[PDB]
Design a protein around this nucleic acid. Structure first.
Ligand SMILES: NC(=O)OC[C@@H](O)C[C@H](NC(=O)[C@H]1NCCC[C@@H]1O)C(=O)N[C@@H](Cc1cnc(N)[nH]1)C(=O)N[C@H](C(=O)O)[C@H](O)c1cnc(Cl)[nH]1
Ligand SMILES: [Mg+2]
Ligand SMILES: [Mg+2]
Ligand SMILES: [Mg+2]
Ligand SMILES: [Mg+2]
Ligand SMILES: [Mg+2]
Ligand SMILES: [Mg+2]
Ligand SMILES: [Mg+2]
Ligand SMILES: [Mg+2]
Ligand SMILES: [Mg+2]
Ligand SMILES: [Mg+2]
Ligand SMILES: [Mg+2]
Ligand SMILES: [Mg+2]
Ligand SMILES: [Mg+2]
Ligand SMILES: [Mg+2]
Ligand SMILES: [Mg+2]
Ligand SMILES: [Mg+2]
Ligand SMILES: [Mg+2]
Ligand SMILES: [Mg+2]
Ligand SMILES: [Mg+2]
Ligand SMILES: [Mg+2]
Ligand SMILES: [Mg+2]
Ligand SMILES: [Mg+2]
Ligand SMILES: [Mg+2]
Ligand SMILES: [Mg+2]
Ligand SMILES: [Mg+2]
Ligand SMILES: [Mg+2]
Ligand SMILES: [Mg+2]
Ligand SMILES: [Mg+2]
Ligand SMILES: [Mg+2]
Ligand SMILES: [Mg+2]
Ligand SMILES: [Mg+2]
Ligand SMILES: [Mg+2]
Ligand SMILES: [Mg+2]
Ligand SMILES: [Mg+2]
Ligand SMILES: [Mg+2]
Ligand SMILES: [Mg+2]
Ligand SMILES: [Mg+2]
Ligand SMILES: [Mg+2]
Ligand SMILES: [Mg+2]
Ligand SMILES: [Mg+2]
Ligand SMILES: [Mg+2]
Ligand SMILES: [Mg+2]
Ligand SMILES: [Zn+2]
Lengths: 83, 127, 62, 24, 60, 206, 99
RNA sequence: GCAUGUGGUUUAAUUCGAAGCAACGCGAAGAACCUUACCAGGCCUUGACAUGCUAGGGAACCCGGGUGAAAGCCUGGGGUGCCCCGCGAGGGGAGCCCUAGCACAGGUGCUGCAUGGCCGUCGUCAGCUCGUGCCGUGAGGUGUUGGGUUAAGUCCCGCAACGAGCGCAACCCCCGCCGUUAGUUGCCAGCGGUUCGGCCGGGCACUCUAACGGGACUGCCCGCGAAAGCGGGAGGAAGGAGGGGACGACGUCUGGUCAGCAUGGCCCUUACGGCCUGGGCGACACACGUGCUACAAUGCCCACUACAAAGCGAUGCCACCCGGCAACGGGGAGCUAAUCGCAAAAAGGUGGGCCCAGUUCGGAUUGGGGUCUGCAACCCGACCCCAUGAAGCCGGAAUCGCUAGUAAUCGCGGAUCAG
């Protein structure tokens, strides 16, 4: 995991959009590309559409899904089975 | 007073110093038998003496560096024989029969490319 | 925390992950590797024994 | 036991040091 | 060795870590030797020409 | 996938390097590329003068570029002007004190790189390829040489079928190490495509 | 008092140059520890021969930086005034440290 | 069982080539972004790069805001240099910049069956040929064949042949013995001083380091043979090519590669060019190839104790102290290095444990907690510690390697490289 000295990593510009959405009490959909961002408890209850290489898919953020990074909730490849 | 002989064997170099007396032998600041603690081969190193009958009539101050201990053994073993002749040029006659003056030319073979090992070719298996 | 009381926590830990709907979740669900291994070969301890299927005729003719 | 990362052999082969094969 | 990527190669990039070497000659990305800034093709070629100084052919 | 570059084989035994200097790991990378930028330019700018070798000796902030050329006047220039222009443009691209001297390849018939070239030109100028070769090899042996060999390969003539022509006289002992053997290679660039000329010249047993 | 290291690629020129320095220090009034052959640091390179595939053929090149030490104890002035007048091989680097 | 490559299938994309030996740990000696050629999305259009040209606006250049995932898009200020004419206002000009338009650049788009170069290959196999003479109407033969010998078209005898060229051999490198020159950062034999470390004096003997040399020729003896040469012995460190390297003949494969580079021809030019962010190359009902680790007692674990070589490193290797189970972190000496370091060599040796068990064998898989690199470890890094402790009890039909310091076995280094 990420070293504990440097805290966690979220892209400033996603963290940006939420603080404005919090410090105004608004719950409007967000889209981003930075899968790579951790999930601070500040994001909780929001909805973030994240890129999976093709589209943005909504990801409602509940409590228990905080330690993780956003990408874990939009798989990148499509699988059915073999026929 | 001393008699020297320089024995090498396969990346090992032995420095043999002979001085008559009891029979005791030092390698690298330890007793011969403590240095080669549990090595069977070790005894062979003192075959050059035994085959001229001068074991006991000498001591040895020896040093080795390089190789594994066995390599050091056949190097000492050379070095002693090399030394028995600077002392007594007539000893050659006794040693050359079993060829104790012969530097073992044998040595580790260059790893060659496209092999795994110099010879050990990679496996061809199936079709 | 020991015995079956520990089996509890590990079990309900994976359970969490599936219920979350995260990647490691799906991998657990579908019985695939989880820490990121290859699957085009090996990956056997996760999928148990080998369910051989049909296949084709390569490369020239037969 | 070269695959066993809890032996001297284990760390010897992985080229690492740990509890089970420390430096000095 | 598409032209742009030889130039991009030189562009000091947004992060220290997109630093990558190509061959000062062909521009080849892949088998590039630090020490010469040449690939293992170019190395071979210039070595035979005699234009890499003190670079002999080995043999032991 | 056959024969070894006759030079790199003999290199250090019967044949010398075209760059002679020392450099530690730190500096080498760039003094190399600096040489290659020099040899890049002088090669373009002097094809007219028929140039065999570009020697690059080096000190510290010093470069002794010896240029080996058939027609040494063409390099010099009328008045002495052309050489000054080079030396400045050199010391521009180098940013060091370039010391460019000129050396008269007294006999282009025993310079493989030149024999090579002369043929390639001939091939470009649309000359008969077979004759072109026998007649080149000819000229080489006529001038002392102990052996010689020229290989043109590619779309010979117009030719849909790319083949290979070659010819030799005397001994050209590519296996014999002590054999001084000059090699040179020329590339002919043509409306129908590109062909390569190798020329080997056996010069003397050492 | 004056210690000269000699590092170059070609060992003929390297060795030659060092003779031109063992004698320079003689004809000027001093004794000398001879040209000592320090070990030589080889840099090997192992390129695949062909351009594409065919990994099972390589070619081995090396880069041999040769090292000679030379010491001039009892260093006079008629010594130094015969050293900054030499320089005769090109591919040899000199470094002088009065230690 | 796992690591990699591949077939297939799947996919928005799983970039592309390699395809019997001679494709499959192969191009890749380093795919998280980059690489990167594929896919999705947002962007630029004389373009990220070359040399220019016509017309206008500008010194070049420097810093800040807006929007944005970034790219890009819009916008604010600072700045007036140089060359010529002039007293000056100022006109002209070089360079660089922007806008419009034109030559054009760019293309890892196609064709390796249009090519160069380089390589794989039969094959380090002993062959492939030419001048003259000779045989034959001629294609062609002779020589090169035959008998002996050889690793060898290597030599001997023979012969219508006598030679020669490319090949074999030799000249080059490493290893094995000795010499001369050389004494530091290496070395310690007798000696002086010792904090017991070659540490200090001192010395180069020895080891070594590394530059030049000597040495081996079937030379000697016996036996066989017209000869070449073969068997055996002596002296010798080495004996009949002493061991290993580099070195690939005329040609074959329409072999490989337009994706290293180069290049003919065909194709695209606000798109097949270029920038970016994200995804992919890592997908998984399956199949093969190459390998790692094992299935254990000639073993496993823990402790103590020995003996290497080759490399690498002053943007780095990091000794020693400290915290920490540890990865590692903080402090910090030496070293541009025969000095300082990486560095513990592991098998081995001595002691003790386990006692035939899916085990103190095996270490997959997963849960949890950390470390480091990196803008960033979800897809997809390695490492540490706790817990989990799968298959596997020596492998069917088939099949591979190796003839001596070889195989088997055990560790060590390096290239690429932030990792
Ligand atoms: N390189 C090379 O020579 O081959 C070597 C080996 O791989 C053979 C290969 N063998 C196998 O698969 C077998 N091995 C085990 C797996 C399965 C199978 O049982 C193969 O494919 N054989 C048949 C198959 C077949 C049956 N029917 C069609 N149409 N094909 C074939 O294709 N023959 C060709 C022909 O009939 O012409 C071929 O071109 C050939 C020409 N001369 C010979 Cl001899 N062979
Ligand atoms: Mg922002
Ligand atoms: Mg070995
Ligand atoms: Mg060796
Ligand atoms: Mg291989
Ligand atoms: Mg191995
Ligand atoms: Mg175990
Ligand atoms: Mg191109
Ligand atoms: Mg990189
Ligand atoms: Mg050929
Ligand atoms: Mg060709
Ligand atoms: Mg080969
Ligand atoms: Mg593929
Ligand atoms: Mg292609
Ligand atoms: Mg890799
Ligand atoms: Mg990518
Ligand atoms: Mg990208
Ligand atoms: Mg004026
Ligand atoms: Mg003015
Ligand atoms: Mg093009
Ligand atoms: Mg082809
Ligand atoms: Mg093909
Ligand atoms: Mg006739
Ligand atoms: Mg024949
Ligand atoms: Mg042969
Ligand atoms: Mg012959
Ligand atoms: Mg004493
Ligand atoms: Mg001293
Ligand atoms: Mg020698
Ligand atoms: Mg005879
Ligand atoms: Mg040969
Ligand atoms: Mg083809
Ligand atoms: Mg891949
Ligand atoms: Mg299987
Ligand atoms: Mg501690
Ligand atoms: Mg530390
Ligand atoms: Mg041990
Ligand atoms: Mg025991
Ligand atoms: Mg079982
Ligand atoms: Mg059992
Ligand atoms: Mg054999
Ligand atoms: Mg290793
Ligand atoms: Mg490294
Ligand atoms: Zn290149």
């Amino acid at each position: 995991p990420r070293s504990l000295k440097k805290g966690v990593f979220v892209d400033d510009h996603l963290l940006e959009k939420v603080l404005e959405l919090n410090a105004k009490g608004e719950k409007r959909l967000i889209k981003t590309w930075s899968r790579r961002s951790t999930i601070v408890p500040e994001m909780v209850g929001h909805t973030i559409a994240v890129y999976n290489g093709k589209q943005h898919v909504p990801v409602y953020i509940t409590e228990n899904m905080v330690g993780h990074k956003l990408g874990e909730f939009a798989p990148t490849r499509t699988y059915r089975g073999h026929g | 007073e001393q008699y020297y002989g320089t024995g090498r064997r396969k990346e090992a170099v032995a420095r043999v110093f002979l001085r008559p007396g009891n029979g005791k032998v030092t390698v690298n600041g330890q007793d011969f038998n403590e240095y080669f603690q549990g090595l069977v081969r070790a005894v062979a190193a003192l075959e050059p003496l035994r085959a001229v009958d001068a074991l006991g009539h000498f001591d040895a101050y020896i040093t080795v560096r390089g190789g594994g201990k066995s390599g050091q053994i056949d190097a000492i073993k050379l070095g002693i024989a090399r030394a028995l002749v600077q002392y007594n040029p007539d000893y050659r006659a006794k040693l050359k029969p079993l060829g104790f003056l012969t530097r073992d030319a044998r040595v580790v073979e260059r790893k060659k490319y496209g092999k795994h090992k110099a010879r050990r070719a990679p496996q061809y298996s199936k079709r | 925390k020991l015995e079956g009381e520990l089996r509890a926590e590990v079990a309900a830990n994976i359970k969490r992950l599936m219920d979350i709907g995260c990647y490691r979740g799906l991998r657990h669900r579908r019985g695939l590797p989880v820490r990121g291994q290859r699957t085009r070969t090996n990956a056997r301890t996760r999928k148990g024994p080998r369910k051989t299927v049909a296949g084709k005729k390569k490369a020239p003719r037969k | 036991g070269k695959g066993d990362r809890r032996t001297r052999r284990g760390k010897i082969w992985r080229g690492t040091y740990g509890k089970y094969r420390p430096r000095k | 060795a598409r032209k742009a990527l030889i130039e991009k190669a030189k562009r000091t990039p947004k992060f220290k870590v997109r630093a990558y070497t190509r061959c000062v000659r062909c521009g080849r990305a892949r088998s590039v030797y630090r020490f010469f800034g040449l690939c293992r093709i170019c190395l071979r070629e210039l070595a035979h020409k005699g234009q890499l100084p003190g670079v002999r052919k080995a043999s032991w | 996938g056959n024969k070894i570059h006759p030079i790199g084989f003999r290199l250090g035994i019967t044949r010398d390097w075209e760059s002679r200097w020392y450099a530690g790991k730190k500096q080498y990378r760039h003094l190399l590329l600096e040489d290659q930028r020099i040899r890049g330019l002088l090669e373009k700018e002097l094809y007219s003068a028929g140039l065999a070798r570009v020697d690059i000796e080096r000190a510290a902030d010093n470069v002794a570029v010896t240029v080996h050329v058939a027609k040494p006047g063409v390099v010099i220039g009328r008045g002495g002007e052309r050489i000054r222009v080079l030396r400045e443009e050199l010391a521009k691209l180098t940013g060091k004190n370039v010391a460019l001297n000129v050396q008269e390849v007294q006999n282009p018939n025993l310079s493989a790189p030149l024999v090579a070239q002369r043929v390639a030109e001939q091939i470009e100028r649309r000359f008969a390829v077979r004759r072109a070769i026998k007649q080149a090899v000819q000229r080489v042996m006529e001038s002392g040489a102990k052996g010689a060999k020229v290989i043109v390969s590619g779309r010979i003539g117009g030719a849909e079928q790319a083949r290979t022509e070659w010819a030799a006289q005397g001994r050209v002992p590519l296996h014999t190490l002590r054999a001084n053997i000059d090699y040179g290679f020329a590339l002919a660039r043509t409306t129908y495509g590109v062909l390569g000329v190798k020329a080997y010249i056996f010069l003397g047993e050492v | 008092k004056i210690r000269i290291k000699l590092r170059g690629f070609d060992h003929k020129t390297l060795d030659a140059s060092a003779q031109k320095i063992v004698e320079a220090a003689r004809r000027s009034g001093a004794q000398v520890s001879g040209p000592i052959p320090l070990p030589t640091r080889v840099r090997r390179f192992t390129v695949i021969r062909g351009p594409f595939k065919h990994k099972d053929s390589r070619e081995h090149f090396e880069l041999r930086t040769h090292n000679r030490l030379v010491d001039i104890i009892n260093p006079n002035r008629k010594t130094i005034e015969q050293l900054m007048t030499l320089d005769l091989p090109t591919g040899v680097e000199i470094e002088i440290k009065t230690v």
